[PDB]
């Protein structure tokens, strides 16, 4: 099994001209500076770029790359894409679920992992948690092994690695590379790229390639590089690193001169006489994606429990500040204030959703290009795993605590109307955050947008300004505000049977107006319906906003530039 | 000029046992792994650690380190401590102001820079801005040179560098090291530490030292290291990096065995026969510190102008939402809402104050240990440079825009009372944030805390809950809230002459109470004084809170563990 390519021009701006060569079954290495194409050619051969940007061919064993190539090959991202919050056994069962055949047995899913974890030397850390910043786990040198095992499930013959040495210590990375050398003879073609390599690494290769500023400088086996650059005019001095002396040529102890040397290289002429001989299930996809993020959710108390503690304490403090809202002239202010606060808090806590996707963006990109799932399977699974439970709970913690301490309307149905309304507003604010966060790797940007956004919406929520007293070319903005509908629903839920002028029954007549002596007068003065449709109109508005913002998130995750 | 030391035990946990040696006038290098003491010994010789943690001696030319040692020596931090928002000429004039004598001429301050910037090769980038993420500037390879020039003003004979190679490219760092080699022969003793060095770097040293897990393995000139480890039992193989082969010994191609080899080293015995021969103005300090941060403030539109544009829009949006607050039953809600919203807004921009000190924390530590300023000079200068102008402006932008659009009380004095009250609450929230963020290098911690405090202060400000209707064991918390005093002052400033029941004059009699038909009834019902002392009581409370929180910040910056 060999790779081959010819006449590759890649633009957006051509940081390339054309690269020619083949890669044998062995150990293929790409070296050079960061500004060079050493990181772009690897994405080309692993089909991780825009095909329209690609020009030449990728020919494998006399066949082009099919749609099946990504489903039987493995590319490993340089950062730890593993689930450090889970363990190796759990994560490798995840990667076995979405890559092995549905017909294959769960016994076979038990065995094929044990053919690999036994090979990686990770039998000690099988059930040991991999590791987080807040949970002590396995060393990173085996986090690299964990990712490699994640990309060895269906026995891919073609392996690709994004900088296998960066992020690890010296002897730490040697244990990875010797494992790969064990893979170098078992019929696995490893193609990777290393920045600042070492002679201990350099002494075990099979084929080598050098790129610099989008220009090709070497092709062929790795031993003869030192043999060729002697003829270029240099000599490797006494006791110098050969892999570092290969970069001694680059930056002036110019680029066009060295490339012209390579054009008249016999190593290129044999390749010229070689290439032109060549060139001449969904329920299962949701059964395990939900579980993985579920165990991420359990395996992080500092983000799951730490957002319940805040919910419980703030549930109790608000229970102590208000504590039995009186039906006097101050009752309107307190009830509206708390409803206000509970709604605003839901909204503003839901700017943490931007975390979910922004952190999981790079993992999503790699996992979909690998083909672990349909995008809708990811989207119906992760929302089932994190959007559902983490927002059902605080909408119940607040609801159970602050309801009977404050003495909010003592009916059975109103308790659950408040429960459901807080649940819906949590979902709706999270869905917006989901629409405004989808397809963005930056955090400080989005979080900044969400934050102004809610600050405008609260001005239209109805407490900071009376919505009926806004100029009519602004009163259409009161519909684009999530804190408006939930807050309106809560005011409708609680202010119906209430009275606030003690000793003054107002429901028959309100003498001396400008008084607000019943719940309906406050509710109407805010511009809120009194019919029972006026309650659930907010809920259907919020349900439509959930669906719309989730669809915008779905399209952004679909129309995203994955390459 | 030489350095010398003997029998150094450093604990908090002894990650050291004892290190012995002298450093000649030349090029002193410290190598090893990150877990070793290669970064701690350099802080020991530069007196950047706790002397109580230190055990042994530091003897210089037959004299111990005086208090004058830090005032005539230069340590350079690993990250770019330069002002990339300024230029080289401006920053080197800053470092000339606080290090050269007050008696020395401004002509001499013009010349001594030109004796150095000419030496560094930075004559091209003299007036060129150094560089920010949002302002294109000089390459980082000369940011390193910029910092070194900052630590060469009064001609220190003893130079110290924290990792001169990390953060730069290969040929990028060679230009720094050749400049230092030019400094290696001009009577300047450079003492530094390099992680993962190179033979191009290794071929130009004068003296060498190796540390590993708090154990010393080499001392003496740099050439003989390769000569000594041959006798240890190894041999440097063909075409290997000597500086990387020196770490080939460390991690098993154990620590106690190699240290015992070093105890019986002749290189140590000569040093044993050497060491025991040895061991046997404020107005000026505020004239230029204010200017530097002032030019940081001008040289960042994305943080200075970007926080004005927003104020300007919101001042216009709030100017459009409210626009001529009516004196009707809805007038109370609108006036209280806007006054609430303004106080809150000021408090929230105050939360970016942390970004002032948290970002400038490491620069503050290095600059005070160097002795550029008294702590109070830094504290009376930076507040004059950033706390003063960036909070006088929005308290005027809001004040000028939203006052006459909304039609707030049309008197001359009330306009300026609102102006001053917003100014004071901006200062007070910034002062609290500054006390919380004094002496903390983390952003996400405090920012979380300041938001938490504020969300609690607002619950007491007086809008979300009526302060008179709180249980008496909580009504003492209404004094620890900045949004209470400013909001109280604004309600006192605006609600005096107002009326809100049109057609119903209420100041003579209020028939049919529960009405709130004048400004005083709303103001008293909130628990706010009507005497003119009731206005300025808030201001004196806020002034005391400014002074107290600035004193807490001053003590945290004084009692900080600088080492």
């Amino acid at each position, epitope marked *: 099994a060999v790779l081959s390519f010819h006449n590759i021009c890649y633009r957006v701006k051509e940081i390339l001209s054309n690269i020619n060569g083949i890669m044998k079954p062995g150990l293929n290495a790409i070296l050079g500076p960061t500004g060079g194409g050493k990181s772009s050619l690897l994405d080309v051969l692993a089909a991780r770029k825009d095909p329209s940007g690609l020009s030449g061919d990728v020919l494998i064993n006399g066949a082009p790359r099919p749609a099946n190539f990504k489903c039987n090959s493995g590319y490993v991202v340089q950062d730890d894409v593993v689930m450090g919050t889970l363990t190796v056994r759990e994560n490798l069962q995840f990667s076995a679920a979405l890559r092995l055949a549905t017909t294959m047995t769960n016994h076979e899913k038990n065995e094929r992992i044990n053919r690999v974890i036994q090979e990686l030397g990770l039998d000690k850390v099988a059930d040991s948690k991999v590791g987080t910043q807040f949970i002590r786990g396995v060393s990173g040198g085996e986090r690299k092994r964990t990712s490699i095992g994640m990309e060895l499930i269906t026995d891919p013959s073609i392996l690709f690695l994004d900088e296998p040495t960066t992020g690890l210590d010296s002897s730490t990375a040697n244990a990875v590379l010797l494992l790969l050398k064990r893979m170098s003879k078992q019929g696995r073609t490893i193609i990777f790229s290393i920045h600042q390599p070492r002679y201990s690494i350099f002494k075990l290769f099979d084929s080598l390639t050098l790129l610099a500023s989008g220009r090709l400088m070497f092709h062929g086996p790795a031993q003869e590089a030192l043999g060729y650059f002697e003829s270029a005019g240099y000599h490797c001095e006494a006791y110098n690193n050969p892999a570092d002396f290969f970069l001694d040529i680059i930056n002036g102890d110019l680029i066009e001169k060295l490339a012209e040397i390579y054009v008249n290289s016999s190593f290129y002429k044999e390749t010229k006489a070689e290439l032109h001989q060549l060139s001449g299930s969904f329920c299962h996809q949701l059964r395990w994606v939900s579980k993985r993020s579920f165990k991420n959710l359990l395996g992080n108390p500092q983000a799951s429990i730490a957002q319940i503690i805040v919910t419980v304490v703030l549930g109790l403090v608000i229970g102590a500040i208000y504590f039995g809202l009186k039906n006097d002239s101050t009752g309107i202010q307190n009830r509206a204030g708390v409803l206000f606060f509970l709604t605003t808090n839901q909204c503003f806590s839901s700017v943490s959703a931007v975390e979910l996707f922004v952190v999981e963006k790079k993992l999503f990109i790699h996992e979909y290009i690998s083909g672990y799932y349909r995008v809708s399977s990811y989207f119906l699974g992760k929302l089932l795993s994190d959007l559902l439970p983490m927002r059902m709970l605080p909408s119940i913690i607040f609801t159970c605590i602050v309801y009977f301490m404050l003495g909010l309307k003592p009916k059975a149905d109103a308790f659950f109307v408040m429960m459901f309304t807080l649940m819906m507003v949590a979902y709706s604010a999270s869905s917006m955050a989901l629409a405004i966060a989808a397809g963005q790797s930056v955090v400080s940007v989005a979080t900044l947008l969400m934050t102004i956004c809610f600050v405008f919406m609260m001005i239209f929520s109805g407490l900071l300004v009376n919505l009926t007293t806004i100029a009519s070319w602004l009163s259409w903005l009161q519909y684009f505000s999530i804190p408006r509908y939930g807050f309106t629903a809560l005011q409708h839920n609680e202010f119906l049977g209430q009275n606030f002028c003690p000793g003054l029954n107002a429901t*028959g007549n309100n003498p001396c107006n400008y008084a607000t002596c019943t719940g309906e007068e406050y509710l109407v003065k805010q511009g809120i319906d009194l019919s029972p449709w006026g309650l659930w109109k907010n809920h259907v508005a919020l349900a439509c906003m959930i669906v719309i913002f989730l669809t915008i998130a779905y399209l952004k995750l679909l129309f995203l530039k994955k390459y | 000029a030489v350095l010398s030391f003997h029998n150094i035990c450093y604990r908090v946990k002894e990650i050291l046992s004892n290190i012995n040696g002298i450093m000649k006038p030349g090029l002193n290098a410290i190598l090893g792994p990150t877990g070793g003491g290669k970064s701690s010994l350099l802080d020991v010789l530069a007196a950047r650690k706790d002397p109580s943690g230190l055990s042994g001696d530091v003897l210089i030319n037959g004299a111990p380190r005086p208090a004058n040692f830090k005032c005539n020596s230069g340590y350079v931090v690993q990250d770019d401590v330069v002002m990339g928002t300024l230029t080289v000429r401006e920053n080197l004039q800053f470092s000339a102001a606080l290090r050269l004598a007050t008696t020395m001429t401004n002509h001499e301050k013009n010349e001594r820079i030109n004796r150095v910037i000419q030496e560094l090769g930075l004559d091209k980038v003299a007036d060129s801005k150094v560089g920010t993420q949002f302002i294109r500037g000089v390459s980082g390879g000369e940011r390193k040179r910029t910092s070194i020039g900052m630590e060469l003003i009064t001609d220190p004979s003893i130079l110290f560098l924290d990792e001169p190679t990390t953060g730069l490219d290969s040929s990028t760092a060679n230009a720094v090291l050749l400049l230092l080699k030019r400094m290696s022969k001009q009577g300047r003793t450079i003492i530094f530490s390099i992680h993962q060095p190179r033979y191009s770097i290794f071929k130009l040293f004068d003296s060498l030292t190796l540390l590993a897990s708090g154990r010393l393995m080499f001392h003496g000139p740099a050439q003989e290291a390769l000569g000594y480890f041959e006798s240890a039992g190894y041999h440097c193989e063909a075409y290997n990096n000597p500086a990387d082969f020196f770490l080939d010994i460390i991690n098993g191609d154990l620590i106690e065995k190699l240290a015992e080899i070093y105890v019986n080293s002749s290189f140590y015995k000569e040093t044993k026969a050497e060491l025991h021969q040895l061991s046997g103005s404020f107005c000026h300090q505020l004239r230029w510190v204010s200017k530097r941060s002032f030019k940081n403030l001008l040289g960042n539109p994305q943080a200075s102008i970007a926080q004005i544009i927003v104020t300007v829009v919101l001042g216009l949006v709030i100017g459009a939402i409210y626009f001529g607050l009516k004196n009707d039953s809805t007038g109370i809600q609108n006036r209280a809402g806007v006054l609430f919203f303004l106080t809150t807004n000021q408090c929230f921009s105050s939360v970016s104050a942390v970004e002032l000190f948290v970002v400038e924390k490491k620069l503050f530590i290095h600059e005070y240990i160097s002795g550029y300023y008294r702590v109070s000079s830094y504290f009376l200068g930076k507040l004059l440079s950033d706390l003063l102008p960036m909070r006088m402006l929005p308290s005027i932008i809001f004040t000028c825009i939203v006052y006459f659009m909304l039609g707030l009380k049309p008197k001359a004095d009330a306009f300026f009372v609102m102006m001053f009250t917003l100014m004071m609450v901006a200062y007070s929230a910034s002062s609290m944030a500054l006390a919380i963020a004094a002496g903390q290098s983390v952003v996400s911690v405090a920012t979380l805390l300041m938001t938490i405090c504020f969300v609690f202060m607002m619950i007491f400000s007086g809008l979300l809950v009526n302060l008179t209707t709180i249980a008496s064991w909580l009504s003492w918390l209404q004094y620890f809230s900045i949004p209470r005093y400013g909001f109280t002052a604004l309600q006192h400033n605006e609600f005096l002459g107002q009326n809100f029941c*049109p*057609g119903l*004059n209420a100041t003579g009699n209020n028939p049919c109470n529960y009405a709130t038909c004048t400004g005083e009834e709303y103001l008293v019902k909130q628990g706010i004084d009507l005497s003119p002392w009731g206005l300025w009581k808030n201001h004196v409370a806020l002034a005391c809170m400014i002074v107290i929180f600035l004193t807490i910040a001053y003590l945290k910056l004084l009692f900080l563990k600088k080492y």
Partner: antibody
Amino acid sequence: VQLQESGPGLVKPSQSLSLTCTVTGFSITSDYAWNWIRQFPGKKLEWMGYINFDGGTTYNPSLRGRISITRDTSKNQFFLQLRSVTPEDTATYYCATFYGAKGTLDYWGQGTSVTVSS
Amino acid sequence: DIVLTQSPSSFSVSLGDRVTISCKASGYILNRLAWYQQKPGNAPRLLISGATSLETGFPSRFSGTGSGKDYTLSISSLQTEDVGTYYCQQYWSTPWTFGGGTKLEIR
């Protein structure tokens, strides 16, 4: 308590209109709000706007920029100044007195008619 | 705004009859519904405030029975001196729109 109008019962179109309501039995600076009404032929009433007891005023938003109400407090008068008068609003005009707490048009004028023709 | 539709623009009744004048509102008024009575050649005399109260200077026959939006006036056994033009007014909002005004007749 006792209101009465006195003004021109005719006007040329598109120039102006002046009416004056002199209040006796009560002082217009004391308690109430004072508003104008007009009733068209083909009777439909149309409230026009009120001046508060303290000079503040609010006008019917259909009549923007056209109606203004001033007051001469030293003799208890308030003035209806209606500009750019179309011939269509040739209604019968009234001045009326609003309680604020009772909320209703408690007292009314006598009734002055304005005919806008040429 | 709030428009007050007196859907029965007129009537044709006789003496001693209970007539019921509706006043359908285009929004909740909450008993802020006044009733006037304009005899021809006069200003509208106030008849009923608050949609349930009464004004001194009338018999106990005019009586408003309104709730929500469907306010109405009941004249039980009307007299000769009670034919007129009854205007219902909302004094809830600021633009105090009146009703169209029904007009009683004698058959």
